[PDB]
C-alpha cells in the first residue's frame, strides 16, 4: 500500500 | 498500587531535545503506541527518544532512538478522533523487571470482554498511577460533548471513549498524554486505550477521553508486519 | 460459548459450530491441560508485573 511521507529525518522534520 | 511505586513496566516517556513530549506504551520489544496529536507541532527536533524503566541511579533505565512514527490517514490535527501513533524503535529494548510490554489484545476479546471491565489503570508522568471508571457505551455520545467540534471527523463516538474525570490542571500532562489505559482480566493486563485528553489537563472539569484501541488492532498488526520504508513520520491508510 | 463468560477461557476464546469452544493464549503464553489456563513461555510475558510475582 501507499503511505504518505511527512518527514525524512527528525532534523529536517517540519509539521 | 498495582504497579510498584506507581511505575508500570510498559510505560514509556517520549523526549525531544531532552524535553518531555508525551507518554506511550510498549507493546513488544520494538513497538510503542502513543497518540497522533503528540506530533501536531514539529520544529527544530534533533531527535525523538523513548525512555523506559526505573526513573524514580542508573538502575534499570533504557533509552531508545525512535526510528519511525506512523499515524492513520483519518487523523486530523486539532480534532479529537483517530488519535493514535505507532512508533518503531531503532533497536529493541531488553525486557527486565522494570521493562515489560502491555499485551495488545485480539479485537474480539477486547470488544466482548475487556470493554465491559468497570475500572482501568491509567499511567502518566515521575510515573503516576490512576484507577479510572470507564464510561459505558450508552453514555459515550454524551461524555464526548466537550471534545466535539463542528466540521470534525465522523464517528467520534466509535473511535474514542471516556473514563474517569478531571477537575483541575496538574503538572503531568506531557508524559500523561499518549499514555496507556490498561484493563485487567484474569491475571493479565491489556492495552485498551490511549490518553487523548487526560486527567490533569486543562482547568475545566472534563471526562478523560481515550482512543479506543480495539478499533485499531488490525491496523497496528498490519503496520508491524509490513516491509520497512524510509522516513521518520508517515501517514498510513486506515483501515 | 465464547459470548458468555469468555467461554471460561483465561485469555482468548474461539467458537465452533459443531463441538464446544476452544481456548487460546496470547503470544508468550501457552495453554495448560485444563484447556482454559495460560502459562508464560517467556520470562517477561506481556501484561504481567514481575515485581508482584518476583
Is B167 within any annotated ligand binding site?
Answer: no
Which of C47, C49, C51, C54 would you mutate first to test chain B, the one with the most B CBs within 10 A? C47
3-state secondary structure B172-232: CHHHHCCCEEEEEECCEEEEEEEEEECCCCCCCCEEEEEEEHHHCHHHHHHHHHCCCCCCC
List the single residue in A with minimal CA-CA distance to B228.
A3
As a whole number of angstroms, the distance between CA C54 and CA C40 comes to 14
User: What is the rounded CA–CA span in Å between residue B59 and residue B5?
Assistant: 15
Distance CA B86, CA B101 (A): 14
Rounded to whole angstroms, the Cα distance separating B163 from B180 reads 12
Q: What technique determined this structure?
A: X-ray
Q: Is the backbone of residue B201 left (phi > 0), alpha (psi -120 to 50) or beta?
A: beta
Domain boundaries, chain C: 1-54
d(CA B54, CA B77): 33
* Domains of chain B in sequence order: 1-8+102-214 (2.40.10.10), 9-101+215-228 (2.40.10.10)
Give C-chain residues touching B93 at CB under 8 angstroms: none
User: Which residues from B are below 8 Å from C15, CB to CB?
Assistant: none
Adjacent-strand bridge partners of B13: B23, B51
Q: Are C12 and B106 in contact (CB under 8 A)?
A: yes
d(CA B64, CA B147): 33
Q: How many beta-carbon pairs below 8 A join chains A and B? A: 48
Query: What is the distance between the terminal CA atoms of chain A, rounded to a whole angstrom?
Result: 23
Q: With left for phi above 0 and alpha for psi between -120 and 50, is residue B48 left, alpha or beta?
A: beta
This PDB structure is determined at a resolution in Å of: 2.0
Q: Which fold has domain C1-54?
A: Laminin (2.10.25)
User: What CA–CA distances, in Å, run from C2 to B108, B119, C12?
Assistant: 10, 22, 9
Cell numbers representing residue B15 in the block? 523526549
The rounded distance, in Å, linking the Cα atoms of C27 and B187 is: 15
CA atoms within 13 A on the CB side of B3: 29
Q: C-alpha angle B181/C35/B109, rounded to 5°?
A: 25
Q: Which residue of A has its CA nearest to B72?
A: A3
What backbone torsions phi and psi does residue B22 show, to the nearest 5 degrees? Answer: -170, 180
Closest alpha carbon within chain B to C37: B186
Say how far apart CA B72 and CA B183 lie, in whole Å. 24
Q: State whether residue B218 sits within 8 Å of chain A by CB.
A: no
R_g of chain A computed on alpha carbons: 9
Instruction: Identify whether B177 is a catalytic site residue.
Output: yes
Q: Which chains touch B (3 or more CB pairs under 8 A)?
A: A, C
Amino acid at each position: 500500500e501507499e503511505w504518505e511521507v511527512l518527514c525524512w529525518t527528525w532534523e529536517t522534520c517540519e509539521r | 498500587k498495582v504497579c510498584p511505586k506507581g511505575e508500570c513496566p510498559w510505560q514509556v516517556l517520549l523526549l525531544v531535545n531532552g524535553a518531555q513530549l508525551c507518554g506511550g506504551t510498549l507493546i513488544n520489544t520494538i513497538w510503542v503506541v502513543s497518540a497522533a496529536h503528540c506530533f501536531d507541532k514539529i520544529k527544530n527536533w534533533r531527535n525523538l527518544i523513548a525512555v523506559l524503566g526505573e526513573h524514580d541511579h542508573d538502575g534499570d533505565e533504557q533509552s531508545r532512538r525512535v526510528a519511525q512514527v506512523i499515524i492513520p490517514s483519518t487523523y486530523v490535527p486539532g480534532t479529537t478522533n483517530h488519535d493514535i501513533a505507532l512508533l518503531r524503535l531503532h533497536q529493541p529494548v531488553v525486557l527486565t523487571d522494570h521493562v515489560v510490554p502491555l499485551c495488545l489484545p485480539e479485537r474480539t476479546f477486547s470488544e466482548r470482554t475487556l470493554a465491559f471491565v468497570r475500572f482501568s489503570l491509567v499511567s502518566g508522568w515521575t510515573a503516576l498511577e490512576l484507577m479510572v471508571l470507564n464510561v459505558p457505551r450508552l453514555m459515550t455520545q454524551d461524555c464526548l460533548q466537550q471534545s466535539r467540534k463542528v466540521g470534525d471527523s465522523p464517528n467520534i463516538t466509535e473511535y474514542m471513549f471516556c473514563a474517569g474525570y478531571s477537575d483541575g490542571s496538574k503538572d503531568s500532562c506531557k508524559g500523561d498524554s499518549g499514555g496507556p489505559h490498561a484493563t485487567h482480566y484474569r491475571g493479565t493486563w491489556y492495552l485498551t486505550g490511549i490518553v487523548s485528553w487526560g486527567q490533569g489537563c486543562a482547568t475545566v472539569g472534563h471526562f478523560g477521553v481515550y482512543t479506543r484501541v480495539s478499533q485499531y488492532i488490525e491496523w497496528l498488526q498490519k503496520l508491524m508486519r509490513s516491509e520497512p520504508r524510509p522516513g521518520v513520520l508517515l501517514r498510513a491508510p486506515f483501515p | 460459548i465464547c459470548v458468555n463468560e469468555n467461554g471460561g477461557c483465561e485469555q482468548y476464546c474461539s467458537d465452533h459450530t459443531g463441538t464446544k469452544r476452544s481456548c487460546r493464549c496470547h503470544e508468550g503464553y501457552s495453554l495448560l491441560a485444563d484447556g482454559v489456563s495460560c502459562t508464560p513461555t517467556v520470562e517477561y510475558p506481556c501484561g504481567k508485573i514481575p515485581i508482584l510475582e518476583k
